[PDB]
Structure formats: structure tokens, C-alpha cells
């Protein structure tokens, strides 16, 4: 019953089904097969080179299927017609999709989402344009071939004795339509060869995703042994809802899914708010409403005070609008495809949303609540077509005495003024003229480089847009007095946008801005970026400061979603708190010059006036903002993008003039016939003459934009602070119009989202209605619009930053992709990529995913990542070597290798992955392996692994490879500009640098910093990576040939560093009983393996999570801005070890100045080490990423309280050693809780037997002072630790 056997058997049968005739034995470490490709064969034929047996080897390998290349068999991948063994189901959705197919004559060239267009056997221009749009729109990306997914779905369905409907429609398709398309295994992005409709890939991809969900719930319910889910006191079938949504969203999935996702979220938010009694979870935190010191006590039930309020007009209107929105969705679906179906169970749910109770303490309600949020993931990434539209200046609201636009501008300017003053109060100041050329690299993470830069290597010319390379190559030309005074307000000088995908919404568009514009924005907006990122502020309206009011910068800073959103759980369980969340529609459009631009530029100018004395290359400040913001530079600027195309007739193109066909400089898509100007195209455009498409070339089609742009350095700051002004106006107005009805307790602003915690002092209906009306009227008067359909005003529910809380519990939503990807990923390191994916799956299972299904998915993916990456390499007689010779007798063959699934559970350090079969949150290590095999209870789990750990071949990794052939023609002219006063002084003097070089600084000395930063920037660039990948094969053969099937477990990984294996020096004992009372936590929706861990060990109440030395150092280096990407803590430790001990603070400060470090960060870091002086050791802690995932940061582990409660250690051990012991203890206690073993305190025991004490004494002496670097590094023997070692264990 152990998972390690059924999972292995399942994946093995998947292997046979993918590759018939395989000999993939379980015990073998890997399997090697050969494959044939004739793509090189025809081109070698055409150029006069001859071969031996033409295609005859196909003719025999398909049938007799025993071609042997040095005895290694050659197999073929299974065709579509036999993937599901020819089964059929006659699904209604199949003919629904058949009816959805539409001929080419109905094409809309400017559709956001393409429809289901049929492919024609003949070729014509319109369908070549359809192909062009489909290849970059309708595509899959991903990292695994889809056929692997299909085989997995088929066999998993067979194993579960259940059939998913997506598999049914896939089988019904392939039964009669055979091969839909082709995918390159080496290059997954090469999808081609459409057969039936141009929409068939995503469909199948979507048909896959639904299947996973149909399995997920099917497993999840099995872990709770419930027959059906619960809605109040009514049974409900989840697969019915899923198939219902499926048959609805079939014909045009992207658009209708996007426009229909919102009512689901509204429903799940509003469920159960008006139940007559209500069940909540007790909570306790600080006086402030944003406090994070929350603990949880008990479940209770209490009468609902607000039960009478829900009969108001506002709630009735919200319900009406939501339901009618569902009606337009269903009628549009019924109009597009000839179907008569509807969404029954959803309206039976929705008609009584307010009154039906909600039960957090029952799993049946909770799983449903998460499931409705998780439904929307089926369609992939919402790739959407974009268009260019003018700003249409006539619609914006001019200021007038009947409105409040001038008041909003005044308040936002004033708010900016105190924002800058509060930034200055923390000694944050603008950059000096030298500091500007030092640190324009300080640009915000939202910025995008407009112009590209060229890299020349030896010959080969590449283009790039990275901030680092662009700055390093052409920053001196950014602020030169030639490019600064020009304006981007003409056809010759414009700016070009970019596109980016998001997991759920449509394809977002971004603005690419030249550095000559962002740098003046940088100078005035950078200190705000540094300041507002701070966390833990006060959100009281009567507080003078505004630092704590902004949540921007407090985004994933803690790292645990449950931890940093505890205020939502606290306030959602309070009977005295009414929350209001306001969101806008077309918000960024409404940021106009009347309400957003003029006041903000005036505030910037007023705040920069005190600093006007500073001469930025002879430019005065106000004129520098004029560069930064002004007419023709940012405002009223033309932007390029998609060429607008108009539909005409080919005959009309024949009647056109030759001069009208004069193509200009602007590029045109190959499927579109170009003309000169738009005006001559207007002469022949016709709605009924569907023959051809025409695009202009004179450049009269690109748009003109005047509103805010997402490419600026302080976009989020500006939007949030505008939100702050609007919020102040609404509070003032509601206070004026109704005194005492609503009192505001807390306000928060982040991005385009606002949140208010208030107390409502009434239960009357009409008063609430008039209050809501006043709020909406104020928002309308502020030159904006707030949608009442999705505006939130509720007692018992909180939503913030995609986090949902209902009645004190955490209701997760699963939106992480598992099949698709936002952008093409090239796996330069299979091990690191697999670690990233197991991190993602840990998060997903923490959000309520099934644990065992996650293990199955990872055991699938752990074998096919490395395949198809090997080329130009052949293995004969167990020796790996280069591709044949000039003989070319077997030039058409390639080697494919398949790893073993169980390699998922063998530690890194060997050739494996650190996953643990008992619980994914535990990191497998060598010491963990030996303890796991020393525990009896785990034996049945360990048995399949028990015979494999020594047969895993080395993995692929290109980034480690480096060569002396790295010569680039592009050089440096800017390291002298980024040089700060200390290194500039060092380089300026003639010959003191020779005296400087005697210091142990090494490669980061002045002069050498330039070459180091060129080296780092070049190795972090993808321009030259193809050459390294091509050359890497030889070293790969060398590594495989040198591979030895031996396992060693070297206790000391390296002389300077130490790991958790050190903990195996001593013996560990278990004794003593502890309190068995289970704790309380809000995330009740968990798998049992995680649930028992959260039960035995409570939530992390302590903010501190303990801190090693190196992590203290890099957290200090976080304050530094310019060198966070170049200076690691390892170099600092190396220098401090090599520098000596007896130095003072100022000596270290000077050394850090010669390290180019800022003086205040250096002062803090030197003070830290001078405090840590006496008990400081020379040891480095190398942890294998343990206790760093999503779930563990929620547990009360690796804290001081945890150490005092669970661990007792001898006093002899120093700080780094007890840190390693603590990590070992965390792993062991988590493991023991997972298996259900009784909880006991752990003892570190040292026996009085003299031989043992001598052995540990010798080992510690070797560890602290090794025989190898005692020669090289010439360490001082006067450190307190090494002296204490003399009689420590005597």
C-alpha cells in the first residue's frame, strides 16, 4: 500500500504506452533508446552526399521493431490513433465543438480572442493570416510533450476506475480525426501542422487541465470519506458543476471565461454573510487593525447582528446585476453554438446566497469554497490580441465648481510634499551629480528598457534589452547633451510598447521608455521607492505619518501568505468590524492631466526646489523634471504597436493607384497587402466585400497617448497616492453628509486597491442605502467610476491582494499553472528547475491540492525533463563518445535517455532530487537518508529506493561551464562612472594601488572590480549561452565517462563550510513526554500529512525565525543598493577571516569603503561584527534550502521557543554548530510528527567513554582548524574559539 510501488508501477506502464517495446526495467538507473530523424537526410542528399539504405530502415523498424545499434534497440513514438486504444464515448460536447467550427468568411481582424476557424485544404491569404496569428497566439509553451500528459490521464483514469469527460472528448476526436498536429520534443515551441481547426491545441491542453481537476476532487473526497459536498444542508456534486462549466465554456473559451470568472468570486465572497446564527473562530491581536501578532483559540457560534440589513436596495441590486450577467453569458454561448443548455446548479446556489449558512469547521463546505475559486484555471494564460486606440481628449472631465477635481489635485500635491519630507526624515536624500552616474542602476523593478544594445563576440552580433547591459554600454550617452532635448512627438521619433502574459487575465501591455526619461524620473522618485517598502506601520486615520498607510512594498516580504495576511483573518472574525473595499473600472485610463498630471508635477517641482543648487551636468532641477515630465516627452506622445488593418477586396486593390501602393518604412505582416496611407484605404473599405486585408505604411496609424504609463519608475507610487487622495475625499464627504453614522478605524491603499475597516452604528435600511449612494456619488464626482457589481461592503468577509478570509479562516485559491508557462524556458540546469517546481507544488498542496496526486505528477516529470536534451553524442559498448566519424554510416540516429522515477527521492549531492516520500516539505539529505533507513516504521516506504540510490547518472548543467574563449568586442566605458569616491580616490593616485594590493581583498580591489563586473554581466547574459551549450557536450561525455557508481557521504563538505551532516557526530536520544493538546490554525483545508504537522506543532506566533551569521550579513547588505547583485556575504566572510581579529571598527569601515560599500551600511555591519567578536567562529553554514518553503514558514519551527522546548544540547558547541543541530532537530521533529510517532524531547548525548570523546575532540579540531588552509590562509591561533578547543571535551 506504500505509495512508492503503485506510483512506480503506474509510471512504468505509462512508459510502455508511450514507447512500445521498451525494456524499461525498474531496478535499472536509466534506459537508453535510439531514434531516427531524416531532417538532415534530405539536405545531405541534395548536396551530393550519398547514403546506404535510403528510408528502408523505417520500412522494417515499424513492423519487425528490432533494429539494433550496438545492441541498443531503436523504437518509435506511438501515434495519435492508438493513444487511447480506439475507445469512444459519443460525448455531447464533441458535437458541440463540431458545431462551433466556423468558416473563414466571418473573420474579425481585431478580435481580442480568436474563434474556432476551420482549416481549408486550399491556400488563401486570409488563412495564412489565421496561421500567423495562431502560431504565436494559440500556442502551448510548457515543458512536457502533451502526449505524455494524455497517456498519464488515460492510465490514471484506468487505475481510479473513473472516466473524465475531457478524456472522453479527446478520444472521440482522435477516433475519427486522427492526428491533430505535431510537436517537437526538443523544442516544444515549434507547434505546427494544424489539421481540423486552428483552435485544437489549447482545446486539448484545456481538455487536459480539467481532467486533473476531476482527479483532484475525486482524490480529496476520498481523504475525507464523504459522498458529496455540502451547501448549507443540501447535497451537491462537484463533478457535475465542473462538467457543467466545461460544456458551457467549450466554443469560445477565452473570452467567456474571462468575462464570467467575476461572478464566481462574488458568490464565494458573499456566501453565508447573513445566516441567522454564525460560526466563527476566536482570534486575538493588537489594538491596531493591521497588527500581525495573532493567535487562535476556539470555534464559537453567535447571533448575527446584521441579519436585517441584507434586505436593502444595494444588496438586491448587486444580486440582480450578477444574475443578469450570468444570463448574458449563457445566451451568448447558446447563440454561438446551437445548444440549449444552461447553468442549473449555479442558479439554485445563487438564488439564496445571503441566507444559506456557511460552516468553516466542516470540510464539506470548505472544499467546495476552494473548488469554485480553483475552477477558473482551465484556460491557459489568456493570450490576447492588442490594438492601438487614441486617447480621445473630449471625454475627460474639466474642473468646475460643481466638482472636486482641483481639490483632489491639491491634496495629492500636498501628500507628495509630506511623503518627501518623511523620506528625508530617515536621512534618505537625492543622488549627488556623481552619485547619479554611479547609481542610475537604482531604477525600479517595474521599469522597462526601451532601446536595445548590441553585443559583439568572437564576429557574432546579438541584441539585448537587459537593464545591466544597456546601462553599462550606453549610460554615458543617456545624459549627453544631444539626446536629452529631443521629443518623441513625431513620426521619426516614437516609442514602442511591449506585451506580457498573466496567469488569469488577458495579455497585459507595457510601456517601454528610454533611459533618458526614466533617469529624471529616477532622481525624483527613488527615495520614495526606498522608503515606502517598509513594513509594520500604523494605519490609524488620526496618525500624522503616511508611511504605514501604503502597502506597496509590503508584498511577499515575509514570504508566507498565511503569516503576512493575519489581519484579514482577525478582522473577518470580529462582530464589530464592517469592511469596505473599492475597486475601479478603467482606472489607469482615468488618470488624466486634469486630475493626476498637473498637481503631481507641481508637487515634484516644489519638493525639488530646495535642492536646485545641485548642478546635474549644468542642468537646473526644474528643467531636469522638464526632461522627465512635459509635453512631447511623456504627455501627448505617439506609441507604436499592432498595425491597424482594414478589410477590402482584391479587385479594389487592383483599381488602386500605383502611388497608393507605395510601401513606406513601417513593417507589415506577411499576410497583409500594404498601401501608403489610411485615407486612400478608406475609399474602398467595405463590410460585405470580404476578400483581403490592407494595412497602411506611412505611419499614420500608431496611437497617441497622454495618460499614465506603466513603464515609469514610480507608477505604483503615483497610483497608490492618488488613491490616498481619493480616499481622503470620500471620508471627508461621508463625514460631512452623515455625522456619526460611519466611523473609520483603518485605511490601507495598495496599487489600485483600497480597504477600509469601519464601525457601523446603525441597523436601519434606508440609512445604509443613502450612505452607499453618497459614497458612489463622491467617487463619480472625483472623475472616476466604481463598479457597484464588484464593490465590497461586508461584515464577515475580507479580501486583500488575492487573499480571501471568511469568518476567521483562510480560503485559498489555486491559480498556479502546471502545464503551460508564461514564457519559453530553456532548462540550463535540470536539478535547479526541478527544485523550483517542487517548491511550486509544495505551495499548491498547501493551498488544498491533493498530496498523493502531487507526488504522482512529480514522479512523472522527474523522468522526461532530461530527455531530448542530448544530441551529437553516441554510446557504444557502454562507452560514451562523439557522433561517429566522417563515415556517416549512422548519421541519422540520436540517443534518448530516460531516468528513473524513484530518483525523485535521492538527495542532491548525489545526482538526485531532495524530495521526501513521507512529506514533501521535508528535504531529503544524506543524513536524512541514513536516519530514514535506521527507522523500522519507514522500511516498507524505503524498500524500492533501497536498491537504487547508487545507479543515478549525473545531471545536466551548463551554467557551471566556463572557458577562456569568452572574448567580446564590446568593451567598458562606465566602470569609472559607477565608481564611488573611495575607489575613485584609489584609482586616481599613481602608485599607492601597489601598496593597496597587499590586502586580502583580492578580485574586488580597485581596477579588478571592472573585470569582475564585466565577467558577471557576461555570464548572466543569454547572448553567448548558445556557444557554451554547444561546447558543453564534450565535458558532458567526460563527466559520464568519469562517473562511478559509489556513494561516500563525506561528513565535511569543504574546509571552510559545514552542513547538517555534522550533527551525526553525536548520538541523539528521545525521551520525556510533552503536552499532547492540539493547536488551532485558520487553514483547515489541508492534506492529512500537512494537517498532522500543523496539529502537533502550532502556528508560528514568534516573528523572529532565528538567523545564521551569513544571513545576518546578507540582510545587512540588503540595505546596499548598487552592489546587491555583485557582492555576496561569502566574500565578506572570506575577507574578515583573512583580515584578522584584533582590528577596530574604523579599520573595517575603511576596508568596506575600499570595497565600494556605502558608509552607513558598512558602519552597521562593522558594529554588528564588533558586537559578535568574542563568540564568532570561522565556520560557514551551507544549508540545502531546508525550512525555506511556503509551508514551513507557517510552522512554529526554527525559533528560540522551539529550541528551548524540544532540544537540549551540550554547552560546548558554538553558535554555528548549534544552528546546524537546530536544523537537524527541525527536520527530525517534523518527520516524527508526520509518521505519527509519539512526541518526545530530543537529547544530544555524549558518553563518558574516553575513546569516543577523543574521537569527537579530534574531529572538532580538524573541522575548526584544518591541515590544508592552516598553510595557505595563515590563520591566527589567538581566536577565542580555537583556544577554547584545547580543553573543551577533556
Amino acid at each position: 500500500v506504500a505509495i512508492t510501488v503503485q506510483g512506480a508501477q503506474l509510471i512504468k506502464r505509462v512508459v510502455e504506452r508511450f514507447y512500445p517495446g521498451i525494456a524499461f526495467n525498474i531496478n535499472e538507473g536509466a534506459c537508453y533508446i535510439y531514434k531516427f530523424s531524416d531532417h538532415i537526410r534530405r539536405i545531405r542528399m541534395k548536396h551530393g552526399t550519398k547514403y546506404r539504405r535510403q528510408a528502408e530502415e523505417i520500412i522494417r523498424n515499424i513492423s519487425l521493431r528490432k533494429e539494433r545499434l550496438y545492441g541498443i534497440p531503436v523504437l518509435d513514438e506511438v501515434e495519435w490513433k492508438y493513444v487511447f486504444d480506439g475507445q469512444t464515448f459519443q460525448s455531447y460536447a464533441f458535437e458541440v465543438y463540431v458545431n462551433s467550427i466556423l468558416p473563414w468568411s466571418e473573420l474579425d481582424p481585431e478580435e481580442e480572442f480568436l474563434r474556432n476557424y476551420r482549416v481549408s485544404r486550399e491556400m488563401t491569404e486570409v488563412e495564412k493570416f489565421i496561421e500567423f496569428r495562431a502560431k504565436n497566439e494559440m500556442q502551448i509553451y510548457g515543458d512536457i510533450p502533451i502526449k505524455v500528459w494524455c497517456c498519464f490521464i488515460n492510465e490514471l483514469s484506468a487505475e481510479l476506475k473513473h472516466v473524465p469527460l475531457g478524456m472522453q472528448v479527446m478520444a472521440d476526436f482522435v477516433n475519427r480525426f486522427d492526428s491533430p498536429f505535431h510537436q517537437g520534443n526538443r523544442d516544444l515551441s515549434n507547434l505546427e501542422d494544424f489539421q481540423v481547426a486552428y483552435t485544437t491545441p489549447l482545446l486539448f491542453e484545456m481538455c487536459c487541465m480539467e481532467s486533473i481537476l476531476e482527479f483532484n476532487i475525486k482524490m480529496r473526497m476520498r481523504e475525507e470519506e464523504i459522498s458529496a459536498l455540502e451547501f448549507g444542508d443540501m447535497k451537491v456534486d462537484p463533478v457535475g458543476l465542473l462538467r457543467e462549466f466545461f460544456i458551457l465554456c467549450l466554443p469560445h473559451p477565452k473570452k467567456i471565461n474571462n468575462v464570467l470568472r467575476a461572478p464566481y468570486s462574488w458568490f464565494v465572497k458573499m456566501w453565508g454573510v447573513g445566516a441567522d446564527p454564525i460560526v466563527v473562530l476566536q482570534s486575538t491581536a493588537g489594538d491596531d487593525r493591521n497588527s500581525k501578532d495573532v493567535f487562535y483559540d476556539k470555534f464559537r457560534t453567535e447571533p448575527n447582528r446584521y441579519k436585517a440589513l441584507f434586505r436593502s436596495s444595494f444588496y438586491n441590486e448587486s444580486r440582480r446585476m450578477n444574475e443578469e450577467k450570468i444570463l448574458e453569458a449563457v445566451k451568448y454561448s447558446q447563440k454561438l453554438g446551437s445548444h440549449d443548455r444552461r447553468l442549473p446548479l449555479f442558479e439554485k446556489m445563487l438564488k439564496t446566497v445571503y441566507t444559506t449558512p456557511f460552516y468553516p469547521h466542516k470540510s464539506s463546505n470548505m472544499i467546495l469554497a476552494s473548488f469554485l475559486l480553483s475552477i477558473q484555471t482551465i484556460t491557459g494564460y489568456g493570450r490576447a490580441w492588442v490594438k492601438n486606440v487614441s486617447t480621445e481628449f473630449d471625454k475627460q472631465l474639466k474642473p468646475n465648481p460643481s466638482n472636486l477635481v482641483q481639490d483632489v489635485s491639491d491634496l495629492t500635491r500636498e501628500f507628495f510634499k509630506q511623503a518627501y519630507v518623511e523620506a528625508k526624515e530617515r536621512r534618505e536624500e537625492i543622488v549627488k551629480p556623481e552619485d547619479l552616474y554611479t547609481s542610475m542602476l537604482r531604477l525600479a523593478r517595474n521599469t522597462s528598457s526601451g532601446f536595445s544594445t548590441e553585443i559583439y563576440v568572437k564576429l557574432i552580433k546579438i541584441n539585448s534589452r537587459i537593464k545591466a547591459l544597456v546601462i553599462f554600454t550606453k549610460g554615458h550617452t543617456v545624459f549627453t547633451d544631444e539626446e536629452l532635448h529631443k521629443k518623441y512627438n513625431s513620426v521619426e521619433l516614437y516609442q514602442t510598447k511591449g506585451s506580457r502574459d498573466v496567469p488569469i487575465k488577458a495579455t497585459r501591455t507595457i510601456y517601454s521608455i528610454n533611459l533618458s526619461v526614466l533617469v529624471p524620473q529616477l532622481i525624483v522618485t527613488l527615495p520614495l521607492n526606498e522608503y515606502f517598502s517598509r513594513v509594520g506601520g500604523i494605519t490609524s486615520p488620526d496618525y500624522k505619518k503616511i508611511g504605514g498607510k501604503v502597502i506597496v512594498g509590503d508584498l511577499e516580504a515575509t514570504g508566507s501568505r498565511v503569516m503576512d495576511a493575519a489581519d484579514c483573518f482577525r478582522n473577518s472574525a470580529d462582530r464589530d468590524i464592517f469592511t469596505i473595499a473599492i475597486d475601479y473600472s478603467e482606472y489607469d485610463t482615468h488618470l488624466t492631466r486634469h486630475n493626476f498630471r498637473t498637481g503631481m508635477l507641481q508637487g515634484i517641482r516644489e519638493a525639488m526646489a530646495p535642492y536646485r543648487d545641485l548642478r546635474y551636468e549644468g542642468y537646473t532641477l526644474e528643467q531636469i523634471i522638464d526632461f522627465g515630465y512635459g509635453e512631447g516627452r511623456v504627455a501627448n506622445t505617439l506609441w507604436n504597436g499592432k498595425r491597424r488593418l482594414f478589410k477590402t477586396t482584391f479587385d479594389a486593390y487592383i483599381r488602386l493607384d500605383e502611388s497608393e501602393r507605395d510601401k513606406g518604412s513601417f513593417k507589415v505582416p506577411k499576410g497583409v497587402l500594404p498601401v501608403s496611407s489610411v485615407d486612400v484605404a478608406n475609399r474602398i473599405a467595405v463590410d460585405k466585400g470580404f476578400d483581403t486585408l490592407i494595412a497602411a505604411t506611412d505611419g499614420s496609424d500608431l496611437a497617441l497617448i497622454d495618460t499614465h504609463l506603466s513603464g515609469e519608475n514610480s507608477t505604483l507610487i503615483a497610483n497608490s497616492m492618488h488613491n490616498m487622495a481619493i480616499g481622503t475625499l470620500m471620508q471627508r464627504e461621508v463625514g460631512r453628509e452623515q455625522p456619526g453614522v460611519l466611523t473609520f478605524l483603518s485605511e490601507q491603499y495598495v496599487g489600485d486597491d483600497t480597504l477600509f475597516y469601519t464601525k457601523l452604528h446603525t441597523t436601519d435600511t434606508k440609512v445604509f442605502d443613502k450612505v452607499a449612494a453618497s459614497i458612489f456619488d463622491t467617487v463619480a464626482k472625483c472623475g472616476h467610476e466604481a463598479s457597484p457589481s464588484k464593490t465590497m461592503m461586508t461584515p464577515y468577509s475580507v479580501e486583500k491582494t488575492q487573499t480571501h478570509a471568511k469568518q476567521g479562516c483562510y480560503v485559498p485559491q489555486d491559480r498556479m499553472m502546471i502545464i503551460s508557462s508564461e514564457r519559453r524556458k530553456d532548462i540550463e540546469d535540470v536539478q535547479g528547475y526541478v527544485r523550483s517546481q517542487v517548491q511550486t507544488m509544495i505551495t499548491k498542496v498547501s493551498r488544498g491540492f491533493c498530496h498523493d496526486l502531487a507526488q504522482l505528477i512529480l514522479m512523472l516529470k522527474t523522468t522526461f525533463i532530461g530527455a531530448w536534451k542530448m544530441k551529437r553524442t553516441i554510446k557504444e559498448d557502454a562507452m560514451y563518445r562523439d557522433r561517429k566519424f566522417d563515415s556517416n554510416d549512422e548519421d541519422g540516429f540520436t540517443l534518448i535517455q530516460i531516468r528513473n522515477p524513484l530518483a525523485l527521492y535521492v538527495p542532491i549531492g548525489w545526482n538526485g532530487y531532495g524530495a521526501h516520500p513521507a512529506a514533501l516539505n521535508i528535504v531529503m539529505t544524506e543524513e536524512m537518508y541514513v536516519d530514514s533507513i535506521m527507522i523500522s516504521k519507514l522500511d516498507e516506504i524505503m524498500a524500492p529506493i533501497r536498491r537504487i540510490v547508487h545507479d543515478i547518472p549525473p545531471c545536466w548543467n551548463e551554467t557551471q561551464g566556463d572557458k577562456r574563449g569568452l572574448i567580446s568586442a564590446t568593451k567598458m566605458s562606465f566602470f569609472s562612472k559607477m565608481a564611488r569616491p573611495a575607489v575613485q580616490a584609489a584609482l586616481s593616485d599613481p602608485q599607492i594601488i601597489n601598496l593597496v594590493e597587499e590586502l586580502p581583498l583580492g578580485e574586488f580591489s580597485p581596477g579588478r572590480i571592472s573585470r569582475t563586473m564585466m565577467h558577471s554581466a557576461l555570464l548572466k547574459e543569454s547572448s553567448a549561452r548558445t556557444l557554451l551549450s554547444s561546447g558543453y557536450e564534450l565535458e558532458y561525455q567526460k563527466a559520464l565517462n568519469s562517473w562511478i557508481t559509489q556513494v561516500s557521504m563525506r561528513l565535511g563538505e569543504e574546509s571552510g563550510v559545514i552542513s547538517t551532516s555534522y550533527a551525526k557526530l553525536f548520538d541523539v536520544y528521545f525521551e520525556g513526554e510533552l503536552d499532547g493538546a492540539p493547536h488551532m490554525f485558520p487553514d483547515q483545508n489541508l492534506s492529512p500529512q500537512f494537517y498532522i504537522q500543523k496539529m502537533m506543532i502550532g502556528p508560528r506566533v514568534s516573528s523572529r525565525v532565528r538567523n545564521s551569521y551569513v544571513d545576518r550579513i546578507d540582510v545587512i547588505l540588503r540595505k546596499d543598493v548598487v552592489m546587491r547583485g555583485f557582492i555576496t556575504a561569502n566574500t565578506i566572510l572570506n575577507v574578515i577571516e583573512k583580515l584578522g581579529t584584533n582590528h577596530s571598527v574604523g579599520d573595517l569601515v575603511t576596508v568596506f569603503t575600499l570595497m565600494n560599500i556605502e558608509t552607513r551600511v558598512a558602519e552597521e555591519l562593522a558594529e554588528y561584527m564588533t558586537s559578535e567578536k568574542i563568540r564568532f567562529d570561522a565556520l560557514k553554514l551551507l544549508k540545502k534550502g531546508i525550512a525555506g518553503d511556503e509551508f514551513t514558514m507557517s510552522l512554529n519551527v526554527a525559533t528560540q521557543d522551539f529550541i528551548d522546548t524540544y532540544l537540549a544540547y551540550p554547552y560546548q558547541l558554538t553558535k554555528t554548530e548549534v544552528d546546524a543541530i537546530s536544523l537537524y532537530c527541525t527536520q527530525m521533529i517534523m518527520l516524527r510528527a508526520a509518521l505519527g510517532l509519539p512526541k518526545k524531547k530530543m537529547k544530544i548525548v555524549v558518553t563518558d567513554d574516553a575513546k569516543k570523546r577523543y574521537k569527537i575532540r579530534l574531529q572538532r579540531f580538524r573541522t575548526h582548524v584544518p591541515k590544508i588552509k592552516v598553510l595557505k590562509k595563515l590563520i591566527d591561533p589567538n581566536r577565542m574559539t580555537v583556544r577554547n578547543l584545547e580543553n573543551q571535551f577533556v
Binding site: 533507513i933 556513494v1047 561516500s1048 557521504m1049 565535511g1052
Partner: peptide, 25 residues
């Protein structure tokens, strides 16, 4: 140059480890 270990040999000695664990408990 220090103490090493081999998993392969540890594979065939687990019974004595179980015995000594039982003796201690």
C-alpha cells in the same frame, strides 16, 4: 582524509544495528 562511510556495506549490517538499538531500549 577523515572518516568516511559506505551505503552499500551499511545495506547488509542493518540487523546488528537493530540489535544494538533493542539492547539500549
Amino acid at each position: 582524509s577523515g572518516p568516511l562511510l559506505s551505503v552499500f556495506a551499511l545495506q547488509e549490517i542493518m540487523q546488528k544495528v537493530r540489535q544494538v538499538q533493542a539492547d539500549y531500549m
